[PDB]
Amino acid sequence: SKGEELFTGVVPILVELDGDVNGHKFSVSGEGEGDATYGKLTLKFIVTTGKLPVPWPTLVTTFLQCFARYPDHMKRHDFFKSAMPEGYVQERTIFFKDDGNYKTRAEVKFEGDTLVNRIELKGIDFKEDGNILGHKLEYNYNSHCVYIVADKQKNGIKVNFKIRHNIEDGSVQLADHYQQNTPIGDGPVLLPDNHYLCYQSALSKDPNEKRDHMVLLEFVTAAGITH
């Protein structure tokens, strides 16, 4: 169908990422499903081979805002689903405080009945003994809300937010995200009034999986607009 109708049930998800951080090349494949009625995503990511060169938590935001639960009074503000099936391009620059940065470009769109998130990531200037390349981040994830704003001239949305990654020493590693989303096709899209998307995420492991991997459970709920 078109738009939100594509998300009324459980939708299989495929995620693919090709990455390069400080020359260290790697790829990751993920699969799972999203149930936007509950704003719920369940995914498992497996590195193609060997060990992932960066901490899994640092890739959570890069690895599906179309699965957010927009309340019944906010359906006209859901840009993400409105772009489906053709989809949108999501671009980000993520600056890790006192360390390197990731630049990502992803195409989120349906291929058949599967929602696919295909990503290219390039990371540069990371410190060999920093929290990222040094794998000093805790395997967990904090909750928070981000501020969504329309970008009328780009016919999309913009988002700037920070992720606080807990460090084993008790401190926190900040990752400043600058995000832009643009539709792929020339069809209509819903440009929203400013609002919030609130996330709750839990990282875990598959008990029997021997490969380097991450299981992610995420709930995303839109808020901020008056009834």
Nearest alpha-carbon partner for 42 in 205, 206, 215, 220: 215
| Length of the chain counted residue by residue | 227
Question: Residue 120 Cβ, how far from Cl ion at the closest point, in Å?
Answer: 30
Q: Which listed range, 43-51, 70-78, 132-140, 198-206, lies at the site for Cl ion (CB under 5 A)? A: 198-206
In angstroms, give the least distance from the CB of 90 to Cl ion. 21
Residue (166 or 221) nearer to Cl ion, CB: 221
Name the burial class of residue 168, with classes exposed (0-12), middle (13-18) and buried (19+) by CB atoms within 10 angstroms of its CB.
exposed
In whole angstroms, how close is the CB of 103 to Cl ion at the nearest point? 28
Q: Which of 89, 191, 198, 203 binds Cl ion (CB under 5 A)?
A: 198
CB atoms under 10 Å from CB of 39, counted, come to 21
Q: Does 203 bind Cl ion (CB under 5 A)?
A: no
Q: Does 217 bind Cl ion (CB under 5 A)?
A: no
Least distance in angstroms from the C-beta of 69 to Cl ion: 9
Total residues interacting with Cl ion, rule: CB under 5 A: 2
Residue nearest to Cl ion (CB): 198
Q: Which is nearer to Cl ion, 198 or 217 (CB)?
A: 198
Q: Under the criterion CB under 5 A, does residue 221 sit at the interface with Cl ion?
A: yes
DSSP assignment letter at 151: E
- 65-94 residues near Cl ion, rule: CB under 5 A: none
Give the end-to-end CA distance of the chain in Å, rounded to a whole number: 28
- The residues, ordered by sequence, that sit 6+ positions from 148 with a Cβ below 8 Å of its Cβ are 79, 157, 159, 192, 194, 195, 196, 197, 222
User: Among 2-10, 58-66, 132-140, 197-205, which window interacts with Cl ion (CB under 5 A)?
Assistant: 197-205
Q: Judged by CB under 5 A, which stretch of 73-81, 94-102, 178-186, 190-198 contacts Cl ion?
A: 190-198
Q: Phi and psi at residue 120, in whole multiples of 5°? A: -120, 130
Nearest residue to 192 (alpha-carbon basis) of 89, 88, 70, 91: 70
Task: Summarize as ranges the residues that interact with Cl ion (CB under 5 A).
Answer: 198, 221
